[PDB]
Amino acid sequence: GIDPFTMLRPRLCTMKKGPSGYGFNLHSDKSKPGQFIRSVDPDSPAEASGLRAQDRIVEVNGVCMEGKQHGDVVSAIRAGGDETKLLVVDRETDEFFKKCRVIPSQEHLNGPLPVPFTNGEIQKENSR
């Protein structure tokens, strides 16, 4: 049959400053050090572009959230000027990129996807 998530690629939401921003709420915790979408408001460019709550950010506005901090994620968004691109993944999508040794960057959703048995793909890990 047809599989709803056989195209396992991160969704890209593009929104621009409307009211006091892009229309999404980022939550920060002393347990979850990374940033995640807490809430989206109906009348927002974020909601319109297909962003939801409880979505997690892997890249924002072309910047990679590879262990990035609160200041880093804000820097990525603010550097976009008046508009931003949000990459979010659900647990199903998140695990796939991890197991394939790759960050779910925008290049994967638009272009090529990695492969299993990722011993053939020479990941550049050296030193301990």
Next chain:
Amino acid sequence: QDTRL
């Protein structure tokens, strides 16, 4: 606290 955008 949070951060809204």
